[PDB]
Amino acid sequence: SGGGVGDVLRKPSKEEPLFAARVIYDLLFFFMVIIIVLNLIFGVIIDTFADLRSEKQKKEEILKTTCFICGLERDKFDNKTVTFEEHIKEEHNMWHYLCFIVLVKVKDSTEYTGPESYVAEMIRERNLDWFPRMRAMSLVSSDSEGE
Amino acid sequence: RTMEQIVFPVPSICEFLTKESKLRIYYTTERDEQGSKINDFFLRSEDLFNEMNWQKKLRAQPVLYWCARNMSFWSSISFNLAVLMNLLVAFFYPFKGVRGGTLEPHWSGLLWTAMLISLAIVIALPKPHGIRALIASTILRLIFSVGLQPTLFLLGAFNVCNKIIFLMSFVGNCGTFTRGYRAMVLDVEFLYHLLYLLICAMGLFVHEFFYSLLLFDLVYREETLLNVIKSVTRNGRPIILTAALALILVYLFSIVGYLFFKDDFILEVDRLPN
């Protein structure tokens, strides 16, 4: 209700000796509590909108302008007949990776090929260093220059 | 540290994967610490393999599979019915037999005619949208046939049957059924849905407000509203700490006012006669 300790007390009006102290009390309560504290809680709420929107925008731009598993940043695939739109679909599609994980799981622990044994060795026992962390075999050129 | 490229046949079990969980795993995974999404992807890969096993096992259900396909339809019917029946219980609670026609039914009759005209205009222009408008018009017409209490009882019975057939759809559409009973008891959304069912049943039985409670619990679900509530609640510890700061500050001001301005604390009041 607005002023705070004002408009509910007795309103001394200039006759009592306690008038100046009452005015100071009223104005000081109104300033610190009603301005600063309520403005602090609402500044906290607005700041949380700012942080949440910043997180969402960062997540969306890093989801759209970079590759998945591959990790590249979509400016490396500017030329040389392998663009990003088919690098996502045909080269580093994660659905093919899930297909490979379930192919390792379903198959009968024998009579499979070479790389599947290596992958199943890295899956069952230990870590995940068989993923293409930052390399894609499309940025690399021919080795004729050193040869 | 050399890189290969292998081509393999896709397993026949991978085609039993839904589009919803597909989009969920595409949009939900996050970079753990070293700018990489691999670690959470492997754990949800194991969970996805278990989910595809459950989906392949449940494909031979089909009546249960037919029930579990159209769960968004059950959710939409439950939500629209809850909103409509909250609107009916809001406008009319003196009840004691409201069907007396003390100039209310004439205005209600004109409102029903206008609503029927608007529903006809909506069905004419927007033919593909507004399937629930016909059901709302039929429910409004049933209010003119029988009393408000039988209509409310019918709507409550339809709501509880829709919820009890939606729970079976939700149980079927998840793999927690065969892991045991404590596994689905430990689930959070399952507990929320059973709380919703208990609230709906107790509203049908005991004193019949309770639909405001389920309305709050169900409208609170949607994504943008949940986003703004996540904005008010994600940093809740500073908010409660500065609320405690306000509390101690007004405690100090109360101490000072009690100390000196003790006789200036009179307040206006009107008493009720005995």
Add this chain to the structure above:
Amino acid sequence: LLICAMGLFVHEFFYSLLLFDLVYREETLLNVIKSVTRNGRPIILTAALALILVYLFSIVGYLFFKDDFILEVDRLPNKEHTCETLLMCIVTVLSHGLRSGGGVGDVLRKPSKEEPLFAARVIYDLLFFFMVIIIVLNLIFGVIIDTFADLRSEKQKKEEILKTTCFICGLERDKFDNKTVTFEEHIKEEHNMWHYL
């Protein structure tokens, strides 16, 4: 300790004081108080701007609307109205009316269309309400919100530069992408500052 001892001895309130001093310590509460106090010089300067602006409005109100400054009052027994002309009483009445909604409205005499001074009174009321109550209070709260924005920006920049770069080494964690020396062991085994200490 002195506050606690004096509370045990003398008149025993004092625990509100030590409670304030001790709850004020914790990190997130100290962070929001640092948001209100880190840019305190603009806040006190625009408070002084509010003070001189209401001093100007008090001057104008004393000049023309001198007899419209009556206020309701109830006296304590040992006409329920009073009028003040001292220009300290005018300034304190105007700071009394600085809060409570409209401002100079709902405390003065409300002339209502009969006096020739009606249009000037309406202009005075509306102009006070607009400039002071909208603009100045919105300025102090915009300053506070801007200080939250700056403080959060500084904290985020500090955290990302602490996590995504090396310490003493100075590199930016994208140089260690390959070639058998990654950043996670470059921090621990090569450029650990504890080995430097």
Add this chain to the structure above:
Amino acid sequence: NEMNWQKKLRAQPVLYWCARNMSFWSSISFNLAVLMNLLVAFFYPFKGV
């Protein structure tokens, strides 16, 4: 152009002494204005206060 003017005015020095400490004049004017506004604020019934 400003350095040309400064070189020409270096031979003033009494005017140059006046022009050196202009921040002092500004500070004196501001403090005096604030103080005399405080005095004219608190006491205006005057009629021989």
